[PDB]
UniProtKB/Swiss-Prot annotation:
Residues 101-121 dip into the membrane without crossing it. Residues 23-25 are lumenal. The chain holds residues 1369 to 1498 of 3419 of the full protein. This is Serine protease subunit NS2B. The chain crosses the membrane at residues 2-22, 26-46. Forms a heterodimer with serine protease NS3. May form homooligomers. Interacts with human SPCS1. Interacts with non-structural protein 2A.
Length: 130
C-alpha cells in the first residue's frame, strides 16, 4: 500500500533533514546549532511513515479510509465524489497543521537550518498528508 506518491513525501522530509545540517554537525557547530538539527529531526520524525503506520493503528477518524482496517496509505487525493481521501476533514484546519510543523521548531537555535527545514516542510505538506 505504498504508491509512488511515497516519493513526494520522502523527498519533502529528506530535504528538511538536509537543511537541518546547515551549519550543524560540521565539527565547528555550536551547541545551539546541534539543537537546531535535533529539532528538525524531531519534527521530521513525527511525519515519518513509521509514525503514520502507528497513527493508522490508532485511527479513529471516520472519514479516513484506514479506519476500515485498510493498510496505511500515503496517497492523499481528492475523489470525483468531492471526498478528500485520507484527509482528516473533521480534524484541525490544514493551515494550523502546516503552521504547527514549522512552529514546533525554534529558529533561535539555528537561524539557518530551521527556516531551511521550514521551507522543505512547506513543500512536504503540499502532498495533503497530515
Amino acid at each position: 500500500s505504498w504508491p509512488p506518491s511515497e516519493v513526494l513525501t520522502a523527498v519533502g522530509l529528506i530535504c528538511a533533514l538536509a537543511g537541518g545540517f546547515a551549519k550543524a554537525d560540521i565539527e565547528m557547530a555550536g551547541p545551539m546549532a546541534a539543537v537546531g538539527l535535533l529539532i528538525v529531526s524531531y519534527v521530521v520524525s513525527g511525519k515519518s511513515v513509521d509514525m503514520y503506520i502507528e497513527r493508522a493503528g490508532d485511527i479513529t477518524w471516520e472519514k479516513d479510509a484506514e479506519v476500515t482496517g485498510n493498510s496505511p496509505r500515503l496517497d492523499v487525493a481528492l475523489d470525483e465524489s468531492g471526498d478528500f481521501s485520507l484527509v482528516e476533514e473533521d480534524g484541525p484546519p490544514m493551515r494550523e497543521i502546516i503552521l504547527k510543523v514549522v512552529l514546533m521548531a525554534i529558529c533561535g537555535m539555528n537561524p539557518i537550518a530551521i527556516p531551511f527545514a521550514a521551507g522543505a516542510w512547506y513543500v512536504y505538506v503540499k502532498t495533503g498528508k497530515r
